[PDB]
Amino acid sequence: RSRKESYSIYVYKVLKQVHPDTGISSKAMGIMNSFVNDIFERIAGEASRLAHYNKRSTITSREIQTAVRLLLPGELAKHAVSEGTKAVTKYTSAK
Amino acid sequence: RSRKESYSIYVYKVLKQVHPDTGISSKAMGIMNSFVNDIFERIAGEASRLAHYNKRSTITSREIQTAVRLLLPGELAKHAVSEGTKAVTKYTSAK
Amino acid sequence: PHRYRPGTVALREIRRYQKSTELLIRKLPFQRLVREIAQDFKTDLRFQSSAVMALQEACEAYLVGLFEDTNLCAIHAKRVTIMPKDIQLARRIRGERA
Amino acid sequence: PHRYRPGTVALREIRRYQKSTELLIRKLPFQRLVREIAQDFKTDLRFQSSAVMALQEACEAYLVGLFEDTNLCAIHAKRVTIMPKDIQLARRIRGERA
Amino acid sequence: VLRDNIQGITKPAIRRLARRGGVKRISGLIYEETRGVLKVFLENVIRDAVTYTEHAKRKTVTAMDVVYALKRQGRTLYGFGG
Amino acid sequence: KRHRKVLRDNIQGITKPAIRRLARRGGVKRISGLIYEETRGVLKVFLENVIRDAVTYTEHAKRKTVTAMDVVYALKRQGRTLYGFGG
Amino acid sequence: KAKTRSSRAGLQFPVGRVHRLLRKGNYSERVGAGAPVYLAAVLEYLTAEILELAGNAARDNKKTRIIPRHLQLAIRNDEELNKLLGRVTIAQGGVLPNIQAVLLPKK
Amino acid sequence: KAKTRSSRAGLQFPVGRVHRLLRKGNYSERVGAGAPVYLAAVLEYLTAEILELAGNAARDNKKTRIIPRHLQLAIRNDEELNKLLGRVTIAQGGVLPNIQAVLLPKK
DNA sequence: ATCAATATCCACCTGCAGATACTACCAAAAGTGTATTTGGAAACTGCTCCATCAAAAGGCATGTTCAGCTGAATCAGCTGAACATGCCTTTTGATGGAGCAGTTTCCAAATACACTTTTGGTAGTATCTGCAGGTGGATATTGAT
DNA sequence: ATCAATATCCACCTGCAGATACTACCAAAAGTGTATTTGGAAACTGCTCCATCAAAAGGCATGTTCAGCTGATTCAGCTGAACATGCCTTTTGATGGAGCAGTTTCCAAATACACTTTTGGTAGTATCTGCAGGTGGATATTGAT
Ligand SMILES: [Cl-]
Ligand SMILES: [Cl-]
Ligand SMILES: [Mn+2]
Ligand SMILES: [Mn+2]
Ligand SMILES: [Mn+2]
Ligand SMILES: [Mn+2]
Ligand SMILES: [Mn+2]
Helix, strand or coil: CCCCCCCHHHHHHHHHHHCCCCEECHHHHHHHHHHHHHHHHHHHHHHHHHHHHCCCCEECHHHHHHHHHHHCCHHHHHHHHHHHHHHHHHHHCCC | CCCCCCCHHHHHHHHHHHCCCCEECHHHHHHHHHHHHHHHHHHHHHHHHHHHHCCCCEECHHHHHHHHHHHCCHHHHHHHHHHHHHHHHHHHHCC | CCCCCCCHHHHHHHHHHHHCCCCCCCHHHHHHHHHHHHHCCCCCCEECHHHHHHHHHHHHHHHHHHHHHHHHHHHHCCCCEECHHHHHHHHHHHCCCC | CCCCCCCHHHHHHHHHHHHCCCCCCCHHHHHHHHHHHHHHHCCCCEECHHHHHHHHHHHHHHHHHHHHHHHHHHHHCCCCEECHHHHHHHHHHHCCCC | CCCCCHHHCCHHHHHHHHHHCCCCEECCCHHHHHHHHHHHHHHHHHHHHHHHHHHCCCCEECHHHHHHHHHHCCCEEECCCC | CCCCCCCCCHHHHCCHHHHHHHHHHCCCCEECCCHHHHHHHHHHHHHHHHHHHHHHHHHHCCCCEECHHHHHHHHHHCCCEEECCCC | CCCCHHHHHCCCCCHHHHHHHHHCCCCCCEECCHHHHHHHHHHHHHHHHHHHHHHHHHHHCCCCEECHHHHHHHHHCCHHHHHHCCCEEECCCCCCCCCCHHHCCCC | CCCCHHHHHCCCCCHHHHHHHHHHCCCCCEECCHHHHHHHHHHHHHHHHHHHHHHHHHHHCCCCEECHHHHHHHHHHCHHHHHHCCCEEECCCCCCCCCCHHHCCCC
């Protein structure tokens, strides 16, 4: 009866932007959740190491960016980096 | 000239316990230092994860113990676990 | 009386099984084997249904992958027949042993 | 004008190099190669001399290990001569290019 | 008619796994070899799973115990949580 | 000023005899003539990958000097942990 | 009055939740304000990329519902996604059709 | 009567150091008092294990000083240490002498 | 099974590099107790979901037959090992210069913290409907002839 | 080539397992307003990275020569693949309780404070001493004949 959080609401929302007439099975959604959690952990873990190696107490978007460059293959990294930077800009340029 | 600490002192004490007439090159000592750092991180990492998986915020000797059983092979795990248990029992009773 | 030649059905099965995703070991015998092995580590264990299924997905995906590498080792030695030594080479180079 | 047979000196060399630990690639050429590659990623870099030596120790250990795997691939094909296809199989099974 | 549990992984089922792996022809000795490999795989993963069970003071191996086991064994599995 | 001399073709400094020596340490008795070029290509890939990561740590730190530690962390990331150079 | 950080950053993925997961995962003592935004956007981007290709694989197989099979086909047929996920198993994914040439019959 | 925690626990390895490295490493919010004691002991045990075997390899090679080669011979000739360190490179370690049987001369 | 060419081994000998070993320290750690907050073991239940278990149902153990695979024995051409010869580069060890890591001090920015206001997200459930196969029949593949 | 036996494809159906949709309530996100923390900006070190160059050994490049390995051929005998059945194991579905996990409780144990003491890592020096590498010189190892 306790709350069991997941990313499935947000995966579903992104599914509708990308393929408005396409659904997703429960099993497929579990795979997507696994996916998000795995990449979250990889990125956050690399960022943590980066901060520790540079004797910093803080993970900023700069540790997230460098972690993305270390972890993603070329073209994925480029677009991820540009998406990340765009979201931070939009978020700052927003009273 | 800022202080760069290592396990050298303690590695050398243990060396003299096991092989009283045996020395060690600085390159060998660099290796032993890497080894201790490496095993520390592996055990501490497994312990961190294990505590998170069980929604605990404290790493106790019980997390260290399970991490040791997860990381070390058979006989090394057995003997490590005895030496760890015995150091704690002694430490607790030696106050 | 009709008869397909050696290799014709084998190719058919490859095509059939590479198209599909159903598990290929029967459930009950796998479940038994899991429980047996687990009994040597701790007695009187129960398993969630999903625990056994995770185990079977992982185990079958591993064996399928190993059979691909095994097949490449057989082919490397100019054979089309997989042998224990092919499985053994694949495992050694993977770092799973030796 | 005496002669060792093909294989004899090769075996002698295996024994010699498996006994020793010194780096087998010349230092300066390796250093130039590191600087060339790094310069293509980023201009105006400097290197601690130990950084270069760490790279050389890692490169050599990697290649020695790869040759061991390659040798096993050749022997699996009933040869004693390593070929590009042995290196490629070793790398494929290692998951460096799976 | 008692028979070993490992032998419940039958020649036809092993054959099916091989087929999905792209294998056309199989030596008779493969079946026992494959059973040995499967057992080592199950031993290593179950040992770690049960170690997580014991640590959580449970008598039931969860999907998450298996998932964490698989992850640390370098066999990350998606679709069963985590 | 002076400006660094142009570095080109330094992969050929990984000579046939150096490659034979590495193969000998790896237990190899007989070596096809095509091995040397194949090995240079494999080595280049390996070095590029590790240097790419090392330089990424150098740049993240805002340095112009690649340290032993940048290389040690890169090798670790790559599942090639190296002992004897710090960390 | 109260705007979500997601809506400010222009994201479907939850910036606030990501921030909390960063705090409580013991990654660092402190977390900058941009970090969860950036991370959320990266995770959303990657999710969109997989669902895009998986959706296309569903379409190719005359289906409107994405199943694990379609995720597997998407990932393994894409060089970069296959590499990112090289050490991962998709349950109920199966494998790519692939028969080594020398195994094909002749006549 | 300031007693070190190492002396209390019966250890050569530094308990205080290990406690602090666990605290600064962001492994968990809190660290139990037993944790660094148990961990320093394990690390000490493993270093004794390695140094015993490496000292033997040094003695076997008629040497008084342990060098990286002796560490490599110790680790790679011990099944368990070899497994624990299977993905580690010991700089200036070399390899074990080992020639595949088919490569030796004659019949 | 002899002997000759040459690689191997081994034990001594030097003169350092690199190790040990003091100081003689002293900055940073570690650790000594108080004051302080709080994580989680423990004890209780209830409700999932797991082990069992007995009926229904569909893979597999089996033996025989022969297609075609593997592995053997042979052979030829050609590669790649070995070695002699000539000499180009790397190794080694300095010199000098400066690029730049590595510190230390202000702190204005940037996080964290304690509280309060609201709401997005979960988890019960209520509906809706993609598609898993089931049918019918047409065509392609395979293999014999 | 024929001809046929069996596999394969496609269009159509339709019940229901498993989706999508809806709803309310609450944990946890966000708004406000202090209260701590931090990580460059400037301003200096000394270190170590770079480059230079000279001398000379040492390893590299090259050409020649031929041993023996690879890969092609052929082939016989072996071994797995194909195939037809009824029994046996699997699977399917529904019953009872083991234990998960939810929840509150409280105290042993952890954090924070701010002092005191000790250590470990240093720079400075001396000071030793294990062993690298070199020489004979004794002793295998290899390959020819
Ligand atoms: Cl930030
Ligand atoms: Cl504890
Ligand atoms: Mn001893
Ligand atoms: Mn600076
Ligand atoms: Mn259909
Ligand atoms: Mn048709
Ligand atoms: Mn010449």
